[PDB]
Amino acid sequence: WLVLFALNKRVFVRRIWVFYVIYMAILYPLQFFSYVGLPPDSCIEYPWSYWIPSYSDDARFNLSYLLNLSIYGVNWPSAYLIGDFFVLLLASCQLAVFRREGEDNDSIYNDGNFVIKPENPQYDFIDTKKSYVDYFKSFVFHYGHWI
Amino acid sequence: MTVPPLLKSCVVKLLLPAALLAAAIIRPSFLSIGYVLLALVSAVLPPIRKSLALPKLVGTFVIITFLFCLAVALGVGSYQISEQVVHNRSDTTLFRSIGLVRFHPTGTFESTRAFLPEIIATSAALLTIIIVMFLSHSAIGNSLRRLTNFVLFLFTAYVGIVKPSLSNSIYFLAFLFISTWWSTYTPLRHGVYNQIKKFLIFYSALHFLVLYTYQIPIVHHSWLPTGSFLPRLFGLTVLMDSSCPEDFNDDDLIMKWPLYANPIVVLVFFYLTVAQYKFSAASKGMIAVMTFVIFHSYSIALTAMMTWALLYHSIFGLILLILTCILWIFRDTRKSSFAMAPIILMYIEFLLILQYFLSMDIHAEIGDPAWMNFVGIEWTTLPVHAVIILCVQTLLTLPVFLLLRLARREKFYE
Amino acid sequence: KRWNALLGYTLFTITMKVCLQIFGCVFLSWFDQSGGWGKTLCIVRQLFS
């Protein structure tokens, strides 16, 4: 998802962000259900206990763990859930931003030519010294590529 | 933008042949012919001195290197893959001759050896790609030049000494010819010097070709055995014969320095020759020194001539000592040397060529004729002693050779 | 274009590292071979981390 996001312009991201947020909001309950798994009282084995019988028990356990498939009596880390929740928070808030949005966030190069544009709404911050915010602006928009 | 033309050109022209020769001496095959030829075509290439970018002829040679190296690497890889999929006969003879070798899991320098030459070839090809795509953007000096010409003269002598045979017989013949021309004190034309250098480079390239292509296991196994009539006469020694699970002559003498040193010595000779082709007490003190030098040159040369008579035993040496006492018995010692310098030069050069013939790589081919039992100079069966003794011989005959130089110089002064 | 290529290469290597995580945690048993081929793949395991 990250790869498809980064190497595409903002129009494609705007088109696919609803799909992405739906996918994440479906996976999160699915991931929690996978972490919970079947009750031990049910005494029903899982299909991924025999996906790779040619290997040792450790390999099968790690394969189920990386696929986030349920293991009887395993302590799932909370960091996974916290990270996925934060991804869900950011995805939902960015969806809200996407619905209420004009043409401010995307690139100014959608016109096609890459020469200096005739007029821009903001002054020449490099020569002027409006405030300390101007100092930070010059530092990060003039030496940010160095960082 | 700061592309160093000379630096990267030297890196190419020196190291890529260096790793080339390393991967060659790793294993011999038709890769010998092709890959050593790619090395030796460069020779003394037109330098990229920030003019006209890369030379057109140099660029053509380099792109030929691209094509040949890529084709060879791809062919070896494909043939190895085919052998792996499918798997001492004629097919196996071609298997060694192409550049492939059997793969076994039990070698630090052998298991890697199954694919190392093509890996080195591909690495050299990639470096050539990068460099070709990136490059497109005196009195003491004269004295040192003559000194390095003199040490190149001594190196011609030494590389003739290391393997006395028809492979170096022409080396010794060119040595003696240029030495006699230089001894007459006649300024040898730079055209003749260039012709001599060109002949030396051509025959040296032929020498590398024959010595290595003969080092291929199939050549010495099939066409003619190692140390047979032609190797004993012209001079052909195989260094490495160890191969993958299906090393020269004998190790009676452990050192065998000349035989092991022949490849590297002749290689550095080639490099020096191609580089050279491309490249108070007042006056009374040393004027009196030079006067004493010209008044005692015949004396010191004759004492060295005695020293030769001490070191080496022959009825020829008896002739040497009787001529020595004849020259040192009369009052006209300087005039006697002045008059009989050509005769003594002819005698000593004949003795050089005679001991050279006696020290040829041939052994028991001539037998032991009447000039052996009666006269008695050793056959020099061991080459370790032979190289040292003949080097002593030439470093000793240098001044008795210079005496004719001085005699001729004085002679045309009047 | 060059900066976007750097972006794409960083995302290429992030994907390769994530996919090699599972290759090293459960697919590492193909790496328990004998010498030679196993030695070479053991080295490539070292140099791909």
Curated annotation (Swiss-Prot), chain C:
Disulfide bonds: none
Expression sites by tissue: Expressed in the pharyngeal-intestinal and spermathecal-uterine valves and in multiple reproductive tissues including the germline, somatic oviduct, and spermatheca. During reproduction, it is expressed in sheath cells, sperm, both spermathecal valves and the spermathecal bag cells.
Domain of life: Eukaryota
Locations listed in the record: Cell membrane
Mutant lacking the gene: phenotype: Reduced brood size due to defects in ovulation with incomplete constriction of the sheath cells impairing oocyte transit, an accumulation of ooplasm in the uterus as a result of 'crushed' oocytes, caused by incomplete opening of the spermathecal-uterine valve, which in wild-type allows the fertilized oocyte to be expelled into the uterus, and sperm navigation defects.
Spans traversing the lipid bilayer: 11-31
The protein's role, per its UniProt record: Pore-forming subunit of a mechanosensitive non-specific cation channel. Generates currents characterized by a linear current-voltage relationship. Plays a role in reproduction by positively regulating inter-tissue signaling to promote oocyte maturation, ovulation and fertilization, and sperm navigation from and to the spermatheca. May play a role in regulating cytosolic and endoplasmic reticulum calcium ion release.
Misc. comment: Piezo comes from the Greek 'piesi' meaning pressure.
Family as reported in the entry's similarity comment: Belongs to the PIEZO (TC 1.A.75) family.
Protein name: Piezo-type mechanosensitive ion channel component 1
